[PDB]
Amino acid sequence: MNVLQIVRDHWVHILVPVGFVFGCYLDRRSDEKLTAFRNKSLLFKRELRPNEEVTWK
Amino acid sequence: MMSGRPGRVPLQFLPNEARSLPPPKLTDPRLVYMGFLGYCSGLIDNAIRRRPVVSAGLHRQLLYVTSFVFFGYYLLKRQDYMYALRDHDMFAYVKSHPEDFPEKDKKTYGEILEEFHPVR
Amino acid sequence: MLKIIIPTTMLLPMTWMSKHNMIWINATVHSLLISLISLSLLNQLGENSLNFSLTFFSDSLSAPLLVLTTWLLPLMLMASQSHLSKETTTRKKLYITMLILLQLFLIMTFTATELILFYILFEATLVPTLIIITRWGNQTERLNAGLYFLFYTLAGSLPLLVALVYIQNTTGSLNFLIIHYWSHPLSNSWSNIFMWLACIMAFMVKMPLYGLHLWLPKAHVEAPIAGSMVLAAVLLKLGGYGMMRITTILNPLTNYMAYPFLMLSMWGMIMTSSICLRQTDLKSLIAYSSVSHMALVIVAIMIQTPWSFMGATALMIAHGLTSSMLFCLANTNYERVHSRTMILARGLQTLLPLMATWWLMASLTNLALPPSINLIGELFIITASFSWSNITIILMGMNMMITALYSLYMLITTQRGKYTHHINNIKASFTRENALMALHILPLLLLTLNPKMILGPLY
Amino acid sequence: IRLQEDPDPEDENLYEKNPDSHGYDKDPIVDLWNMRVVFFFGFSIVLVLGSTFVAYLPDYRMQEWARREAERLVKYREANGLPLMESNCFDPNKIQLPE
Amino acid sequence: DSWDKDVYPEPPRRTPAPAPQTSLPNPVTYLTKIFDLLVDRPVTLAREFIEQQHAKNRYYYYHREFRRVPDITECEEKDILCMFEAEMQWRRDYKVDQEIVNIIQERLKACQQREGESYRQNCAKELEQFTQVSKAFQDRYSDLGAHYSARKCLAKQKQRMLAERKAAKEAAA
């Protein structure tokens, strides 16, 4: 149904939504470099559970 | 200032010993911004020549991104070199000059007399 | 963090590459969508600010302003698609480009973790607004108006630049957390006052206090509708955000040096509100009202009291939403009459009955009628000020008394009274203007149920 | 004639071309569609769920966790008879005040 | 009961037995009666239905507990790693102490209506408890500034026994 044209005039609508899902990616990538004191602060440091290896992602 | 350090061979954009540093990763955020600059030149390049900006001469702005990325990449390695160099001989100096860098005494905040000003 | 920024900047290619007539639609879609995502950021923990990285972080103060700016973004698009319809598609796209580029900077500065990073886009907001005021402004004296607005802030901002870099060379980093934890008692040495003056005057200028305020009437009146809202609803408030952030290393020097500003602000609000009582221009009257409310925050922030900060953040937002609405009221009336004089179009209620209502809660909200967020702001500030000194209530309450007279003064002169005979072009209000007006008032009363969201980190 | 210019255009009324005009833009079909966007993506998805989202937001500022701790703490304190909340905060026993 | 009686001491209610002598009917008994079988019972009927449904699928939640962590008086100078734990612990205790005053304030306000015209003398214990709390609260956090930090709280406190011990030296003479 006209798809050759609804795509051309409404392909802009996907830009921002992928931008958001992209924005989460760098958000969930930059934190990895910020690991450092992962389960290290004595306020929150505790015994590591049998299966999971990382307390906070 | 590194203008006359011992070993600086003149007109050497990237000295050989700089290769001992982690090279900039191919998608370094600084690098892609350098690629942005190449693209941003491309859009306006068709603008002055009055061409259909975005869809105008795909070859032209494609070369712009390539040129800016490479010239960016070598710049980043050179940029990383000096900062590594600036920090390197920094540290070599302070060990060579212990007397000018005293280790400040370890006093907790309990013994520190910091006067208090009320807000009233 | 990023989940707001890339959606904002990736919105820019959409408007440029969208269809010829769909620009307003798709921009409005995702601007509201961005607002929804920003609202997801509104959550805050107990005491530690929501920290994201070295480059960005948010606290209980930044978050309410962030959601306000994103919430604003659809409103200018809604408010502007009437006087820009007869314009070339490129200029319309450029106009939209200016707004979101402006709005992008606002997210950046409010979430900035480093004072210099906060500083770089602190003036960078000026460039898009300068274009908006100058190019699309609909007047003659807008040219001198843009010059006044531009130079005033720069004249105050540049001392901050010299001051800020001095902090870097003396106290290491200028990361907001590292300043707060390593704060030291600023001495009384005669250099530290000029230290104090430079770190404060920059936020003073773009928070119009008596004397340093003549740009605002020239800023607001000649600016177009979208320029007026953004300038009055967020731009006067970067100065506010700076003071809550930068006063960490200005104590106890703030205790003694606060006096000239406090007297200037407290007396200024009586003077400025008096100007409102006899303003010939509707837009100017709203503009001067912003000075009075903003000058109240000057006393609020500069007292440096837990309660004072809380009421500041309450007036921080409530005034911005209200001032944007009143500017919408003036704009929605202006093009119908093609003039700015208040007495030009009297008795509008008999002609437009719904706008009579919209003007009515708008005036009531600016009245600080309880329990509107404005009342929570002013009433909290009065108590904090009264604890600081008993006399100030004479000045404080007098402002509310003056604020009553001029607020309903526009109501009676425009809405009530006899309709003007000669005018005959007043058409029934477009439901766009009606929809936009509810877009402003409805969240305001919605905020009344949850003040704790906008009370701030002191809460 | 000073300059060869054009007379000031007259403000068209969107209503007299199409009575149902909503004031969003000239063309009727997009104007009707702009209505749907401004309301559906205005009041509907932002004001309704956004309010519920912020209203049902999880514990903000630990407003209730502190209460529960206070109840337990106050229940501990008067049980032993010592004052229910000390005038001092950082125990002076450790403090090593100068002279 | 959901809350604790020790946290909220409720003196036993003294409800007199109804012993009227006038022959004409007491109306308020009737309005309470009709209310019972028009509002109270239907509300209870719905309530017992919702409460049994709630117990059909019961999900639990607990109360988060923060273990003790070294505070700011033993944290090293600068060293923001230890300052972070210190500041957060102090601010958490600020929240508890704010709630402690809140709990006492409700108890003081609870006396007012509970004691009626006897409020002036009956709960002077409630008055002094709030007086003890408010005065001690003033010595802890008052006048700390809008940018209050555990450093300032220690600083303000360190002045207190500074003056006190100075007064003690003068008192000893």
Ligand SMILES: CCCCCCCCCCCCCCCCCC(=O)O[C@@H](COC(=O)CCCCCCCCCCCCCCC)COP(=O)(O)OC[C@H](O)CO
């Ligand atoms: C339109 C005019 C300006 C509008 C109002 C702006 C605010 C008014 C004051 C402006 C101050 C600008 C300069 C301040 C820079 C940072 C100051 C700072 O960090 O404090 C220093 C304060 O030191 C200064 O001397 C700062 C400058 C003092 C003011 C004199 C110059 C500024 C005023 C004239 C130029 C600007 C006015 C406009 C001229 C056209 C500390 O250094 P120190 O002196 O303690 O250094 C150690 C030792 O004592 C020796 O250095």
